[PDB]
Structures are given as C-alpha cells and as structure tokens.
Amino acid sequence: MNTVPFTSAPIEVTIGIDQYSFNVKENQPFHGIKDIPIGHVHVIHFQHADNSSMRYGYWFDCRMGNFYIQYDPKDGLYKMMEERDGAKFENIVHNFKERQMMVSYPKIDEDDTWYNLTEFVQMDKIRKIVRKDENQFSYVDSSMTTVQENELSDPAHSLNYTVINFKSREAIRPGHEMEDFLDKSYYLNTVMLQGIFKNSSNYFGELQFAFLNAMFFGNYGSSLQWHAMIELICSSATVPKHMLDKLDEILYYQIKTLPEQYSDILLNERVWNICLYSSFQKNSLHNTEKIMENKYPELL
C-alpha cells in the first residue's frame, strides 16, 4: 500500500481519489492519502471551494515513482511532483503517518469497483494520450480538448484519443460504401483493432480512460470519445463474443458508478437508445441494458 503525501492544504478544496471525494478546509492540517492499493492506476483530483471552475487531477501509478502534492500559489493549483530522494520521501511519509495526518484510501474488502473501472487502463497508454515524457504522472482538466476536436499552445494540454469518424475515408472502403456505413465491422476489426489498437485490451483501456475523464472532470471531448467507442462496437455485426461479453461488464460498472444527478449531462440519449434497442448488438448487452432500464429509464 502506497502513499501520496501533501506538503500542506492552503486553500479549501474537495479532493477526489478514484471514486471517493472528501472536503479539506482552508489551512486544515491535511498531509495526504495513505493505503493506496498497489496494482491499479489511480487518479487524484481537485475542485477548489472558491472556484468550482476547473476540475483538474492526476493519473499516476505508485509503482512508477514516489509522488506528492504541493500547492503552488503562483499557478493557483495543487501541483503533483515526483520526489527522487527515496529516503527523504519514506521519512516524510513515516512522520505524517505517525501524526495521523493522512486519510486512508476507504476501500471495502468486497468492493471491486475500481478494478472493474480500470481493468484495461495502463499508465503507459495514458502517457501516450496525454504526452509529457518528462513526467511519470499525467495532468488532465475539464477544459482540455481532443485532437479530433482541434481538427473541427502546449501539446500536453490536448487529449490524443484515437480519432473515430464514421463518415471518413478511413471508415469506408471505396466500393463498400453502403456495406461499411451500415455495418462498421471492417472499421472496428481491421482498421481499429488489427491496425491501430492491436488488441481489444488496448481499445477497452482507452474507452475506460475516456469514461473516467468524462465523469471525474466533466471533460466533454472524453465523453464524445467514450460514446464513439461504444457506438463503433454496437454498430458492427461481427464482433468477437468475448469482446461483447467484456463490453457488457465494462459498461455495467460505468453506469453503476455514474452519479445519478450527472446522468443528464454524461449520457447521450441517441447513442444509448440506438445501442440498446436498434443496433446489431441490441441483444448482446444484457447486464448493461438491465441497469440502464432500472436506473435511467427516462433517458430511454
């Protein structure tokens, strides 16, 4: 179990760590988060109490370095930094733990939620969607746009998601116009899976990362990407059975975790009604369809 210490907490802020959130008061004696499970990526995220504009946060993996948080009063944000001095870091952490100045990561033993949301998410792939090679953690915020969005300035502040566009020469083989537009299997299996992602694990990793950025930061371009990656599978007549079963599990846990009061802004009615009720895969997502109908029947 690893630790992200904080130098201090000089401004009042709501701090998220994965699916949990808690409030820290201005100058309250808070020195970080302990007991972070090893083996998963994690995100530590922030919304200032005096300006809820800009949610921002960090993707990190404690196996890749010793990370800590320090407020910068110039740039006006809790900045994540790597500590290269290991014995300094261990000594800092041990003292904060002894003084019980840290929150413990609240993981319930039965609870696989975070695993289920990040099953295919790897730091190395996050570091390619968000490019800052100098740093071992990734910084994301509510306002960052995507490469596709910039087709319709510092490179690290753009999300390099894989561009998906159903009316594009990449998606449509000359001479198979109707076939490829009404059945996206070519675009899914040959162009995207075989050609770009290499395997379904990397595709699902990007889909899960897009969802989490949409949920945790309200990042609109990430929400667009999440839905596009769902629609691409649902609109393909030929999808490996293991991919369909895994997609159903992925989406179930995403819909289960989504805050009920954000469903209006985080869920696209057209995509979900098409995917669940009209698409080739309308009968292949039993768990997702059941939770959607019981939790968000208005949308449908």
Binding site: K167, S168, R169, I172, E177, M178, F181
Partner: protein, 237 residues
C-alpha cells in the same frame, strides 16, 4: 445549410449545382398472389438530376434487373442513387463538376455524403422546398424512355426546351415547378391543358409544346387555376 425560400436566387447564380430527386428510383406495383398474399413487382425507375440554371437533366434510368436478388430495396435505392450521382460527378470534367448537390429528401444526405467523401469541397445540402420532381414521369417523353429501357442507361435532356432563349433561368424554373406541381395534383387535367389545342405541337427535340410568349401566360394561368381548383376539391373550400 438547408435550401429554402430565403435563399432561392442562389439556384440561378453561376456556381454549378444539381438537384437530385430519388422518388422515382424504386417503383413497384402491389398485387395479390395466387395464395391471396401480397407481393410487389418492380418497374423501371430513374434518378432525376437537374441543373436548375441550365435546364440540363441527367436522367439515369434504373432498370429492374438492378433489384434482382437484393433485400431492403427501399434502403438500397438510396445508396444506388448516391452511387450513380457520384459516378456522374466523376465522369464530368473538373470545370463541369458541381460545387453543391441539393437532395430533395433528407434520407439521401448520408448515402450521398459517404459516396462523395473523395469530393470534400462539394457541399451536400437538403432543402426545405417541396419540389414536385416526382411528377417527372408524367412527362410523356421521359416516361417513354424509362419504360422502354432494357438495360441501365443515362439520357440527357434539357427540361426547359429552348425557353432560355427568351426567359431567365429563374422564370424557367418557376414555369417548370408550376407545370410539375399541376401534373402532380391532377395529371389528366394538366395534360388536357397542355395538349388541348391541336395547332400547338411538341417539336421532336423538345419535351413541352411550342407555346408563344402570350400562350405561355395563358397556359400558366390555366395551371394555377387547376392547382387552386384541386385545392378546393381536396379541402372542400
């Protein structure tokens, strides 16, 4: 964006554009089978592709063999239309290619957009105008070439005959739209109006009769009366 009454003069500017109407591509008669079920029999159709500035009509005849063994024909018909329009564009010299293609039905937008991906600079537009181009098969010479076709064929016409020698393309299009709306609302009466006087004939190389300017005014008035007459019969006004 969409083409409506606010931007009607745009049809007659110097930017090449084509209307595409697909309402006569897939045509059927519905009938009973020996067992008392219902079946369809396709008949020859046509794509109506019109330059409203010049009158040039690219009439692609859709022979019933293109439907043999296919499913979901009403959907296929939209994609076949888009394939043939794309092939037509590619066959034209660059300086003759349209800058815009206006589809008369919004269901043609995605099929045509996908087929024209290679032409990112050609705008594909819908229209809010309700244009009576479905009545094209009420023009006898057009219906005749479609029904006689034994294979796919493209035939080029000028739908304005020689009218542009005397009137503008705005006035020519308005005449055409009035004639077609009349033929669509009451075909028998419209044809009676157009052919009642045996002394006015249709030249071999034309589609409509050889009316003088003053006779066109009478004809046009008789067509408006027909449209109003049928509107009263329809709504009991």
């Amino acid at each position: 964006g969409a083409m409506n009454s606010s931007n009607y003069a745009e049809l007659f500017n110097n930017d090449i554009k084509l209307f595409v109407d697909d309402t006569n591509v897939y045509r059927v008669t519905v009938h009973k089978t020996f067992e008392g079920n219902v079946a369809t029999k396709a008949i020859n159709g046509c794509i109506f592709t019109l330059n409203p500035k010049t009158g040039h009509l690219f009439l692609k005849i859709i022979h019933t063999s293109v439907w043999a063994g296919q499913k979901r024909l009403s959907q296929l018909a939209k994609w076949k239309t888009a394939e043939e329009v794309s092939a037509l564009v590619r066959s034209l010299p660059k300086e003759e290619q349209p800058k815009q293609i206006i589809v008369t039905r919004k269901a043609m937008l995605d099929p045509l957009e996908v087929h024209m991906l290679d032409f990112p600079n050609i705008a594909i537009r819908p229209t809010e105008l309700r244009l009576p181009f479905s009545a094209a098969m009420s023009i006898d010479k057009l219906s005749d070439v479609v029904m006689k076709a034994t294979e796919p064929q493209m035939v080029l016409f000028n739908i304005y005959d020689d009218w542009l020698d005397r009137i503008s393309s705005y006035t020519a299009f308005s005449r055409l739209t009035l004639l077609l709306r009349a033929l669509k609302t009451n075909e028998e009466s419209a044809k009676m109006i157009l052919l009642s006087d045996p002394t006015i004939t249709i030249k071999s190389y034309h589609l409509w009769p050889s009316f003088t300017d003053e006779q066109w005014i009478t004809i046009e008035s008789q067509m408006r009366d027909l449209i109003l007459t049928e509107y009263g019969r329809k709504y009991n006004v």
